[PDB]
Design a protein around this ligand. Sequence first.
Ligand SMILES: O=S(=O)(F)Oc1ccc(-c2nnc(-c3cc(Cl)c(O)c(Cl)c3)o2)cc1
Ligand SMILES: O=S(=O)(F)Oc1ccc(-c2nnc(-c3cc(Cl)c(O)c(Cl)c3)o2)cc1
Lengths: 116, 116, 115, 115
Amino acid sequence: CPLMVKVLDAVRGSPAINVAVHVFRKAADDTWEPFASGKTSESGELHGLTTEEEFVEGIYKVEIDTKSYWKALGISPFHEHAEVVFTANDSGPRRYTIAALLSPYSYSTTAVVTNP
Amino acid sequence: CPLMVKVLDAVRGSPAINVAVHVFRKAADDTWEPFASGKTSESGELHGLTTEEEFVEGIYKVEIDTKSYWKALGISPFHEHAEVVFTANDSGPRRYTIAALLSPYSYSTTAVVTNP
Amino acid sequence: CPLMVKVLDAVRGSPAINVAVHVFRKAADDTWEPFASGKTSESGELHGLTTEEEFVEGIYKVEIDTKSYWKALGISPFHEHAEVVFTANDSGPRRYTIAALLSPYSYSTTAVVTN
Amino acid sequence: CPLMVKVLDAVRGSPAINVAVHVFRKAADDTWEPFASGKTSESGELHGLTTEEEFVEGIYKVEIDTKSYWKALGISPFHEHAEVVFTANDSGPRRYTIAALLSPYSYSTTAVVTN
Ligand SMILES: O=S(=O)(F)Oc1ccc(-c2nnc(-c3cc(Cl)c(O)c(Cl)c3)o2)cc1
Ligand SMILES: O=S(=O)(F)Oc1ccc(-c2nnc(-c3cc(Cl)c(O)c(Cl)c3)o2)cc1
């Protein structure tokens, strides 16, 4: 609920299904510790990554495995992945949706941040 | 259900609320006849524009009133509106979502088309 | 030149070459009158559309024939065309670049307005 | 030059000027080693990062310091930075332009790869 990832495919005009997503959180020693991971559904959405308790203040990295997506579809894309890096929950809990729109040589990403 | 419009604001990181949307359909004489209109909700979504019966094959124009949106927020933007023009239902009924991501001098639009 | 149009292809990662572009100016009766046109070059650019003298304040529409571009590449696209509609304003900077990034079911456009 | 980076501002409709850009090359041990850096010019461009000799095949990361850019304009942004990660491949065209379009809560990036 606190963190959701939606992915769309600009070539097909569809949700981007079965996209692997890995989330990391910056540790006190400045390394990127694994936080959560999952795959987008048939709707292009990934829910259930974390809980309000576990999703504390910090710097998070959402890595969307765009190359693995395009290669699973038999296409040779430009980027390795799309990375979204942001400070979260620094003014108390918020709900974050990270959205991405994918093409083989381009991608756009935006955030929708709401206060419960 | 057959036609939905979602609008997001890239400056605020939020849904774009209260955005006026006008839909037109090309008539047999090549003019743009009014088809439907409405405003985005607090979620940035506009539902209820049309029915499966009324939404026949044709060329449709979805005009998103981006200038009126930015000016209602006291901002002077570049574009008059964003226009999305497409042939619909030419291989039988489909469900269309027209999405747009807005900035004062830029916007992206994509379609998600599904077969029920 | 006061107005440049640049078109890019997000599928191939290249300029979008030989794309037809039509520019219209809004007339007093709210109809769109032909203003300038051309085809993008090998660099995806279209220069020479107008001059400082002719490009007066007003509402302009740049129509990019995206459907023909995709069909020539053997790809089925969503949109009939991409349209960019804006007001030219003398108080702002002098030079307008209208950029468009094309995919089969999506496009993005931005304006880069400089002196 | 084999590698150009161009940064644009979607709020003001302008080049994004004086933005710090850092380029890294992936090392054999999977760490990111500094490769080239600079600040975008008045045209939002950063030329001169590398040469044909130095820009061998491999995985590169271009990090754009978007947070500092927005803060200097007095705007609160979402991202820490924008990152563009890609493989340089000799079979493809020779010249890579990495373009980024910035908004406070969003960015877009494309690659224009030509000969
Ligand atoms: O959950 S619904 O709103 F119903 O269906 C939708 C869910 C999500 C989206 C959506 N979210 N972001 C976008 C989206 C994101 C980017 Cl970077 C973009 O360039 C464009 Cl044109 C759209 O679309 C659009 C529709
Ligand atoms: O010599 S170059 O600077 F490379 O030629 C170029 C000139 C302009 C652009 C360019 N300007 N805006 C964009 C561009 C525009 C849109 Cl809507 C966008 O989504 C993205 Cl990711 C980039 O690309 C890219 C290349």
